[PDB]
Design an enzyme around this catalytic site. Structure first.
Site, PDB file in Angstrom:
ATOM      1  N   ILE A  22       0.768  -1.258   0.000  1.00 39.89           N
ATOM      2  CA  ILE A  22       0.000   0.000   0.000  1.00 39.89           C
ATOM      3  C   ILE A  22       0.791   1.297   0.000  1.00 39.89           C
ATOM      4  O   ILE A  22       0.227   2.323  -0.308  1.00 39.89           O
ATOM      5  CB  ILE A  22      -1.120   0.106   1.074  1.00 39.89           C
ATOM      6  CG1 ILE A  22      -0.562   0.385   2.460  1.00 39.89           C
ATOM      7  CG2 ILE A  22      -1.996  -1.124   1.079  1.00 39.89           C
ATOM      8  CD1 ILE A  22      -0.703   1.833   2.874  1.00 39.89           C
TER       9      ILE A  22
ATOM     10  N   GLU B 105      -4.549  -2.620  12.494  1.00 41.64           N
ATOM     11  CA  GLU B 105      -5.859  -2.655  11.902  1.00 41.64           C
ATOM     12  C   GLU B 105      -5.779  -1.968  10.539  1.00 41.64           C
ATOM     13  O   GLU B 105      -4.961  -1.081  10.347  1.00 41.64           O
ATOM     14  CB  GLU B 105      -6.850  -1.947  12.820  1.00 41.64           C
ATOM     15  CG  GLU B 105      -6.492  -0.487  13.144  1.00 41.64           C
ATOM     16  CD  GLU B 105      -7.580   0.280  13.895  1.00 41.64           C
ATOM     17  OE1 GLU B 105      -8.750  -0.165  13.908  1.00 41.64           O
ATOM     18  OE2 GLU B 105      -7.257   1.336  14.487  1.00 41.64           O
TER      19      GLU B 105
ATOM     20  N   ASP C 102       4.341  14.497  13.432  1.00 39.41           N
ATOM     21  CA  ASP C 102       4.297  14.302  12.004  1.00 39.41           C
ATOM     22  C   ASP C 102       2.857  14.205  11.582  1.00 39.41           C
ATOM     23  O   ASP C 102       2.490  13.394  10.748  1.00 39.41           O
ATOM     24  CB  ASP C 102       5.069  13.058  11.567  1.00 39.41           C
ATOM     25  CG  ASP C 102       5.700  13.198  10.195  1.00 39.41           C
ATOM     26  OD1 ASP C 102       5.447  14.182   9.464  1.00 39.41           O
ATOM     27  OD2 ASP C 102       6.462  12.285   9.846  1.00 39.41           O
TER      28      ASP C 102
ATOM     29  N   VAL D 157       4.765  -0.942   3.664  1.00 42.15           N
ATOM     30  CA  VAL D 157       3.459  -1.285   4.181  1.00 42.15           C
ATOM     31  C   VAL D 157       2.636  -2.129   3.213  1.00 42.15           C
ATOM     32  O   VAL D 157       2.260  -1.641   2.153  1.00 42.15           O
ATOM     33  CB  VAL D 157       2.727  -0.033   4.688  1.00 42.15           C
ATOM     34  CG1 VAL D 157       1.308  -0.380   5.086  1.00 42.15           C
ATOM     35  CG2 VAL D 157       3.459   0.539   5.897  1.00 42.15           C
TER      36      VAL D 157
ATOM     37  N   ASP E  42      -6.255   7.309   3.427  1.00 40.22           N
ATOM     38  CA  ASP E  42      -5.739   8.427   4.220  1.00 40.22           C
ATOM     39  C   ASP E  42      -6.399   9.720   3.752  1.00 40.22           C
ATOM     40  O   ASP E  42      -6.964   9.763   2.648  1.00 40.22           O
ATOM     41  CB  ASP E  42      -4.206   8.518   4.188  1.00 40.22           C
ATOM     42  CG  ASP E  42      -3.648   8.854   2.795  1.00 40.22           C
ATOM     43  OD1 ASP E  42      -4.327   8.605   1.769  1.00 40.22           O
ATOM     44  OD2 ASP E  42      -2.513   9.375   2.719  1.00 40.22           O
TER      45      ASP E  42
ATOM     46  N   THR F  72       8.979   5.303   3.599  1.00 42.91           N
ATOM     47  CA  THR F  72      10.401   4.952   3.467  1.00 42.91           C
ATOM     48  C   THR F  72      10.980   4.170   4.649  1.00 42.91           C
ATOM     49  O   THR F  72      12.092   3.647   4.552  1.00 42.91           O
ATOM     50  CB  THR F  72      11.283   6.174   3.144  1.00 42.91           C
ATOM     51  OG1 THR F  72      12.613   5.721   2.852  1.00 42.91           O
ATOM     52  CG2 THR F  72      11.300   7.175   4.309  1.00 42.91           C
TER      53      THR F  72
ATOM     54  N   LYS G 218       0.033  15.146   9.333  1.00 43.98           N
ATOM     55  CA  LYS G 218      -0.109  15.579   7.956  1.00 43.98           C
ATOM     56  C   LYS G 218      -1.129  14.639   7.382  1.00 43.98           C
ATOM     57  O   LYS G 218      -1.238  13.514   7.818  1.00 43.98           O
ATOM     58  CB  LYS G 218       1.203  15.512   7.163  1.00 43.98           C
ATOM     59  CG  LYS G 218       2.092  14.330   7.507  1.00 43.98           C
ATOM     60  CD  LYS G 218       2.918  13.850   6.331  1.00 43.98           C
ATOM     61  CE  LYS G 218       4.289  13.414   6.800  1.00 43.98           C
ATOM     62  NZ  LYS G 218       4.871  12.378   5.917  1.00 43.98           N
TER      63      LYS G 218
ATOM     64  N   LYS H 253       3.408  -3.697   8.556  1.00 46.89           N
ATOM     65  CA  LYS H 253       4.522  -2.805   8.344  1.00 46.89           C
ATOM     66  C   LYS H 253       5.770  -3.613   8.559  1.00 46.89           C
ATOM     67  O   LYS H 253       6.062  -3.996   9.679  1.00 46.89           O
ATOM     68  CB  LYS H 253       4.396  -1.642   9.300  1.00 46.89           C
ATOM     69  CG  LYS H 253       5.342  -0.509   9.031  1.00 46.89           C
ATOM     70  CD  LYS H 253       4.914   0.697   9.836  1.00 46.89           C
ATOM     71  CE  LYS H 253       5.951   1.797   9.759  1.00 46.89           C
ATOM     72  NZ  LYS H 253       5.922   2.554  11.036  1.00 46.89           N
TER      73      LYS H 253
HETATM   74  N1  G6T Z   1      -2.994   0.625   9.406  1.00 45.38           N
HETATM   75  C1  G6T Z   1      -2.900   1.246   8.257  1.00 45.38           C
HETATM   76  N2  G6T Z   1      -1.892   2.085   8.056  1.00 45.38           N
HETATM   77  C2  G6T Z   1      -1.833   2.700   6.876  1.00 45.38           C
HETATM   78  O1  G6T Z   1      -0.880   3.581   6.549  1.00 45.38           O
HETATM   79  C3  G6T Z   1       0.431   3.314   7.004  1.00 45.38           C
HETATM   80  C4  G6T Z   1       1.238   4.325   6.268  1.00 45.38           C
HETATM   81  C5  G6T Z   1       0.658   5.727   6.472  1.00 45.38           C
HETATM   82  C6  G6T Z   1       1.432   6.699   5.688  1.00 45.38           C
HETATM   83  C7  G6T Z   1       2.862   6.659   6.221  1.00 45.38           C
HETATM   84  C8  G6T Z   1       3.462   5.257   6.069  1.00 45.38           C
HETATM   85  C9  G6T Z   1       2.623   4.274   6.820  1.00 45.38           C
HETATM   86  C10 G6T Z   1      -2.729   2.509   5.924  1.00 45.38           C
HETATM   87  N3  G6T Z   1      -2.849   3.019   4.706  1.00 45.38           N
HETATM   88  C11 G6T Z   1      -3.928   2.471   4.176  1.00 45.38           C
HETATM   89  C12 G6T Z   1      -4.419   2.717   2.963  1.00 45.38           C
HETATM   90  C13 G6T Z   1      -5.556   2.033   2.539  1.00 45.38           C
HETATM   91  C14 G6T Z   1      -6.105   2.263   1.295  1.00 45.38           C
HETATM   92  C15 G6T Z   1      -5.521   3.193   0.464  1.00 45.38           C
HETATM   93  C16 G6T Z   1      -4.396   3.890   0.869  1.00 45.38           C
HETATM   94  S1  G6T Z   1      -3.777   4.996  -0.248  1.00 45.38           S
HETATM   95  N4  G6T Z   1      -2.685   5.808   0.317  1.00 45.38           N
HETATM   96  O2  G6T Z   1      -4.902   5.928  -0.689  1.00 45.38           O
HETATM   97  O3  G6T Z   1      -3.254   4.198  -1.446  1.00 45.38           O
HETATM   98  C17 G6T Z   1      -3.829   3.659   2.122  1.00 45.38           C
HETATM   99  N5  G6T Z   1      -4.479   1.652   5.055  1.00 45.38           N
HETATM  100  C18 G6T Z   1      -3.726   1.675   6.138  1.00 45.38           C
HETATM  101  N6  G6T Z   1      -3.818   1.042   7.307  1.00 45.38           N
END
Ligand code: G6T
Lengths: 260, 299
Positions: B11, B82, B128, B19, B87, B15, B130, B34
């Site tokens: 996903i 979970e 952090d 994930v 985001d 860096t 954002k 992670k």
């Molecule tokens: N627990 C968890 N953490 C996340 O982010 C961890 C990251 C946050 C940003 C910094 C690095 C760690 C997630 N992101 C998505 C998630 C689910 C669907 C779509 C997307 S996204 N970014 O629109 O492709 C993210 N589900 C998530 N679930």
């Protein structure tokens, strides 16, 4: 200076937490190969280590806590005691310090007794044992909070309270018996009255709920320790507090009296 | 160890580790993994993992991402969280055309402030905030995430790490290089995020240290020892700063009423001591009607 919105919640939380991250009190008695003496030796050595790298006291306060906790559930041989020591400190430094010393540095300061892989593997074991529960309250956290009730905040008392807490860490018995907030309670007042004669403030009774009556058992233990400071085999902690940084506080004469 | 989990896709990153999106083969739980390596440079378990793990155990709250397990492998270390829908960043990006429904913002901000006050009361600074680090579910809730930069603090605070936050959401005192920063910094960020949900564009899109600071001054006015007692004897403060006059807020946040812009203003006071707390903000008249809308997808 700061917006002090959460002092109450924060103090509350550390009081709740300090119970949970509390080590076992008679653990040394269970330990087949290590003695309270050995542990004093270890703590003393940890103290020079802290100086050489200009490390926070907080860093070593955590480190000590990590050890007591680890040795509470893990039987360890004297041969390996120093290594538990070093990993504990490396973890502490990692958690607290802005610039923690390199792994390399830590192996250096061990007489080259142990390899790097040894140290790094130990690091991991300690985390496994503590289940990553590293965010622990210490005496320092309480002092620093407590210090805010002081007007005008007085350097010498502060440097002396800090000094005293540290002394407690060298001695397993009797100090494992006391919670950090109480060790802090004692040291603060004992410093205050050596330097200004003044009393554990009413203010702190209201925050802590501790009375001088309630602190007495600790203070009795702590006084004699200050008294017999120059006869204890552990000296580094004294020498540390002789500098212009800490207003040479170890060189003062402990009070005769407490009104018992 | 992972023989229970089925990776579906990566996903994202940040860096620090990577994930992945996994499903439990036994329970069918869908999780965010992670992955973290330790054999990086024979430098042990990373700091950014140690802190995250130990503080995220301490922190259990409805608006703070759930850490489910931590799996100990010799060379990898997997964190099980979970899993949520997206985001705030990519949702704003999606909702970019319509723009965010008026009370859905109010909701999200309210929840976000509930979360931050929890952190602060457990002596944790996030550092952090954002939109990338804030996750929403389909149920209309929003959680704080990625405590990779977080740290436990002392009272009073000591000098902590300078290179922090993300620049667009970085607070003045840090840009200006102060020796002591506090809870105030997270609030500043949440401030800028509030404004960004509303206007549809970032509040201070700065390109460097100096550029970021001036972008702030050009909106809020350059500060003096009235507005900020201490500013002039700060470490990186320079007497040759230009003198920009502060501007009108309905000009800055056009869709906001009197109350919202009242609130926002207090979240952005140059002075940290003056800057509203997460706690105190929760009691602000703007939250009077606060309800819990549900967002549209079509994902
Ligand atoms: N627990 C968890 N953490 C996340 O982010 C961890 C990251 C946050 C940003 C910094 C690095 C760690 C997630 N992101 C998505 C998630 C689910 C669907 C779509 C997307 S996204 N970014 O629109 O492709 C993210 N589900 C998530 N679930």
């Amino acid at each position: 200076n700061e917006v002090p919105d959460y002092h109450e919640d924060i103090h509350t939380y550390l009081r709740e937490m300090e119970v949970k991250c509390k080590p076992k009190v008679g653990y040394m008695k269970k330990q087949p190969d290590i003695t309270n003496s050995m542990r004093a030796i270890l703590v003393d050595w940890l103290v020079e280590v802290g100086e050489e790298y200009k490390l926070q006291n907080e860093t070593l306060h955590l480190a000590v806590n990590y050890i007591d906790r680890f040795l509470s559930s893990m039987s360890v041989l004297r041969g390996k005691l120093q290594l538990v020591g070093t990993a504990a400190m490396l973890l502490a430094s990692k958690f607290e310090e802005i610039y923690p010393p390199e792994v390399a540095e830590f192996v250096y300061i061990t007489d080259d007794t142990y390899t790097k892989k040894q140290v790094l593997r130990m690091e991991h074991l300690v985390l496994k044992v503590l289940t990553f529960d590293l965010a622990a309250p210490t005496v320092n956290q309480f002092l620093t909070q407590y210090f805010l009730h002081q007007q005008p905040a007085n350097c010498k008392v502060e440097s002396l309270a800090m000094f005293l807490g540290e002394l407690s860490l060298i001695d397993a018995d009797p100090y494992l018996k006391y919670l950090p907030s109480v060790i802090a309670g004692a040291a603060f007042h004992l410093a205050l009255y050596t330097v200004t004669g003044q009393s554990w403030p009413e203010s702190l009774i209201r925050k802590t709920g501790y009375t001088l009556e309630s602190l007495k058992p600790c203070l009795m233990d702590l006084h004699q320790t200050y008294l017999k400071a120059p006869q204890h085999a552990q000296q580094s902690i004294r020498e540390k507090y002789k500098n212009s940084k800490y207003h040479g506080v170890s060189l003062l004469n402990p009070p005769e009296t407490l009104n018992l | 160890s992972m023989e229970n989990f089925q990776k579906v896709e990566k996903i994202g990153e940040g860096t620090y580790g990577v994930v992945y999106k996994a499903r439990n083969k036994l329970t069918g739980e869908v999780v965010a993994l992670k992955k973290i390596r330790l054999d990086t440079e024979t430098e042990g378990v990373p700091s950014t993992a140690i802190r995250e793990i130990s503080l995220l155990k301490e922190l259990n709250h409805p608006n703070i991402v759930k850490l489910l397990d931590v799996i100990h492998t010799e060379n990898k270390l997997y964190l099980v969280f979970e899993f949520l829908h997206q985001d705030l960043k990519k949702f704003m990006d999606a909702s970019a055309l319509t723009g965010i429904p008026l009370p859905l913002i109010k909701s999200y901000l309210f929840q976000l402030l509930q979360g931050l006050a929890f952190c602060h009361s457990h002596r944790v600074l996030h550092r952090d905030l954002k939109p990338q680090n804030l996750l929403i579910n389909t149920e209309g809730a929003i959680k704080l995430a990625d405590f990779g930069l977080a740290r436990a603090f002392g009272v009073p605070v000591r000098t902590y790490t300078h290179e922090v936050v993300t620049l667009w959401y970085r607070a003045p005192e840090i840009l200006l290089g102060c020796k002591y920063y506090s809870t105030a910094v997270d609030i500043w960020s949440l401030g800028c995020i509030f404004a960004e949900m509303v206007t549809r564009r970032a509040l201070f899109p700065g390109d460097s240290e100096i550029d970021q600071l001036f972008r702030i001054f050009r909106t809020l006015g350059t500060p003096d020892e009235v507005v900020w007692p201490g500013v002039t004897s700060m470490p990186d403060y320079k007497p040759s700063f230009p003198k920009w006059a502060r501007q009108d807020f309905s000009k800055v946040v056009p869709p906001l009423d009197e109350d919202g812009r009242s609130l926002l203003s207090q979240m952005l006071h140059y002075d940290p001591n003056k800057r509203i707390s997460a706690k105190a903000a929760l009691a602000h008249p703007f939250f009077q009607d606060v309800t819990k809308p549900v967002p549209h997808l079509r994902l």
